[PDB]
Ligand binder design. Structure first.
Ligand SMILES: Cc1c(N)cccc1C(=O)N[C@H](C)c1cccc2ccccc12
Ligand SMILES: [Cl-]
Ligand SMILES: [Cl-]
Ligand SMILES: [Zn+2]
Ligand SMILES: [Zn+2]
Ligand SMILES: [Zn+2]
Ligand SMILES: [Zn+2]
Length: 308
């Protein structure tokens, strides 16, 4: 039988396999829709199908770099292992967002996936960008399997939305983003650093974008005030340890609810549309008011300068 071997599922390579030998002896580690067939001999109904293989020549290595933006040999295999599960998850439309039916601890992925459908991101690696597009359109198995691989998580492992968003933002074009903070000490006085890229969109310490513009209470080298002078991003992520927080319809984009123990707990997603919508995977609920344990709030921005 003839088959196609790729690394990216774009450059397909016709292959004349031997039927008596395993894939493993001929190509090296070989996969089919995420399922490892390394140790299997070719069945007949495998004829002319696409198998992913671990880059075993320079052409393939270069093609893998250009599609995934990593040369880590574990990557292809971790991706394939995730996909082998994520492809059996369900991806219902809830309030015109692709969510995930709860399975294999995916609270955090659903929340990241819903959040990503509501903010402006361009992913640098083609495999992320192509899968993201496919995901907003309702088929998201690849996109979730990729998030798992890129974040060094595996199916069932407990995940933080804020770490996940953080890892993913490092594969997105934010080069053009900018945060100017000014920090004020009673004794040291004033200093302002610029931050760029990921560090420009994410702050750990309070949920309220308002409070950040009005400044917050951080330590000094000698108890100071860090305030926000200038923001140039399409959004901001404001994060803090879970605390009872009030969400007011129209003052934020969307948010992460986190209920339970450090790590063992469960993420839900609140999005501000015409009313407040709470998406718990496949389950949807709505109310005009919301008060509950929030850990991340996303906000819309273009260009803010301070009047201070
Ligand atoms: C940290 C983590 C990991 N590594 C994996 C899965 C979930 C969490 C978590 O508890 N995250 C929440 C949002 C969280 C993040 C940060 C501080 C927290 C303190 C108490 C309870 C929860 C806290
Ligand atoms: Cl890179
Ligand atoms: Cl990248
Ligand atoms: Zn090629
Ligand atoms: Zn890259
Ligand atoms: Zn599974
Ligand atoms: Zn000081």
């Amino acid at each position: 039988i003839k088959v196609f071997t790729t690394v990216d599922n774009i450059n397909l390579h016709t292959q004349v396999v031997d039927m008596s030998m395993t894939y493993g002896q001929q190509f090296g580690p070989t996969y089919l829709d995420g399922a490892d067939v390394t140790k299997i001999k070719p069945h007949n109904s495998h004829e002319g199908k696409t198998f992913y293989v671990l880059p075993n020549d320079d052409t393939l290595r270069v093609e893998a770099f250009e599609y995934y933006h990593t040369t880590d040999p574990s990557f292809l295999g971790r991706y394939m292992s995730a996909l082998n599960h994520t492809k059996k998850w369900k991806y219902p439309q809830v309030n015109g967002l692709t969510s995930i039916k709860w399975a294999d601890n995916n609270s955090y992925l659903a929340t990241a996936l819903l959040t990503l459908q509501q903010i402006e991101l361009k992913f640098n690696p083609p495999a992320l960008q192509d899968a993201y597009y496919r995901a907003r359109a309702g088929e998201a198995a690849n996109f979730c399997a990729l998030i798992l691989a890129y974040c060094n998580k595996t199916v069932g492992e407990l995940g933080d939305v804020r770490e996940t968003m953080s890892y993913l933002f490092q594969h997105a074009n934010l080069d053009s983003c900018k945060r100017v903070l000014n920090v004020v000490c009673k004794t040291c006085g004033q200093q302002q650093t610029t931050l760029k890229g990921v560090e420009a969109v994410m702050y750990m310490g309070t949920l309220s974008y308002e409070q950040f513009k009005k400044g917050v209470q951080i330590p000094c080298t000698c108890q100071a005030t860090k305030y926000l002078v200038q923001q140039e991003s399409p959004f901001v992520m404001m994060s803090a340890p879970p605390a009872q927080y009030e969400l007011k319809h129209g003052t934020f984009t969307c948010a992460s609810e986190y209920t339970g123990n450090y790590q063992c707990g469960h993420y839900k997603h609140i999005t501000s549309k015409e009313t407040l919508y709470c998406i718990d995977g496949a389950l949807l609920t709505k109310s005009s008011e919301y008060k509950g344990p929030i850990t991340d709030v996303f906000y819309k921005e273009n260009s803010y300068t301070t009047t201070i």
